[PDB]
Amino acid sequence: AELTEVRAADLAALEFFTGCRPSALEPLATQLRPLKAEPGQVLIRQGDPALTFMLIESGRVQVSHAVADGPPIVLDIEPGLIIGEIALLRDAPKTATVVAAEPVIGWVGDRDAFDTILHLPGMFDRLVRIARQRLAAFITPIPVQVRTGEWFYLRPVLPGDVERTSETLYRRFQSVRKPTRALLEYLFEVDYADHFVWVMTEGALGPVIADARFVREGHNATMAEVAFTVGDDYQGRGIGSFLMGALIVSANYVGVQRFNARVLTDNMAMRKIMDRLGAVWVVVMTEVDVPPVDTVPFEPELIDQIRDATRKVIRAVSQ
């Protein structure tokens, strides 16, 4: 096998693999297959099983999602990324068609080959960074005014945010067969189905200062646990209350009908949040229905923006 050495070689020369030694890519070489495609060619058809990912060396591709009612909704991406890795890890059927807009050169691997990549030095963080950059393009932070009169910016979490934050990861993602930590961790960073996190930032592109999440009690449950965090300087400023409003809009839109929570005696704040939905305490715990979108005290236009942001980010992460 001499191809393998030559393979490793081409791989090493990709932007994607900058700073890896060609030899250290030799096993991965054994697991990747080159692909060439012509303009117009389907690289991935909607309804296909998720069997492989593709690493594209060069060639612009076009992603579209066919809707049963009215024409397919379409988008470009430049090369240098991986496509199909979410569906692959989720074993879901593809929901979006992908077509070569330009001649396409690249590399196809299975899930084991993707796990190989995840373990190569530097590579898990690099993949998270590529995901973060791709997703940022689908986020417009929404300026929001908290009851203090301070302005912050509301946006879905991004891959890489340090607040995104193993056993908790499996106990969710239990539908991934024979998984690795690395596979679970990467899916965690790009998950907007089972997990939905809202972040509030100091300025439109500034640090996260608070966050709120729901975690469905199983892949697709209408019951979801909630948790809120608020940074140090920022307590008692109306923030968790606001985020809860964002969290309600997102739940409704994706069909989460119920919330549960539990934590410390100490943070009344959390009790006060659940309180406002008429919680039921039994360190303490509760369940509540998610109220109708009706009752979050935000302007209709803000409701539509939070829903569209929810829409866009889910759609980014649907392959």
Answer yes or no: are the C-beta atoms of 276 and 226 closer than 8 Å.
no
User: Which residue's C-beta sits nearest to Cl ion?
Assistant: 177
In whole angstroms, the minimum distance from the beta carbon of 97 to Cl ion comes to 17
Restricted to residues 129-188, the positions that interact with Cl ion (CB under 5 A) are 176-177
Whole-number Å distance between alpha carbons of 310 and 247: 10
Closer CB to Cl ion, 12 or 82, in the complex: 82
Which DSSP category does 291 fall into?
A: P
Token match 């704040």: residue?
Answer: 269
Amino acid at 158: L
Select 137 or 268, whichever has its Cβ closest to Cl ion: 137
Task: Pick the stretch among 10-18, 42-50, 71-79, 214-222 that binds Cl ion (CB under 5 A).
Answer: 71-79
Q: Does 108 bind Cl ion (CB under 5 A)?
A: no
Distance of CA 56 to the CA centre of its chain: 21
Question: Number of residues in contact with Cl ion, rule: CB under 5 A?
Answer: 6
- Among the listed ranges 75-83, 147-155, 204-212, 258-266, the one in contact with Cl ion (CB under 5 A) is 75-83
How many other C-beta atoms are found inside a 10 Å radius of the C-beta of residue 171?
A: 9
Give the relative orientation of helices 300-316 and 239-254 as an angle to the nearest 10 degrees: 60
Shortest reach from residue 100's CB to Cl ion, in Å:
14
Distance CA 315, CA 182 (A): 24
x/- site string to Cl ion, residues 254 to 293, per CB under 5 A?
A: ----------------------------------------
* 81: contact with Cl ion by CB under 5 A: yes
Please note each residue after which the chain is broken, C-to-N distance over 2.5 A, or write none.
Answer: 165, 282
Region of 3-11, 81-89, 98-106, 267-275 interacting with Cl ion (CB under 5 A) = 81-89
Neighbours of 194 (CB within 10 A): 20
Q: If binding is defined by CB under 5 A, does position 91 make contact with Cl ion?
A: yes
Residue ranges in contact with Cl ion by CB under 5 A = 77-78, 81, 91, 176-177
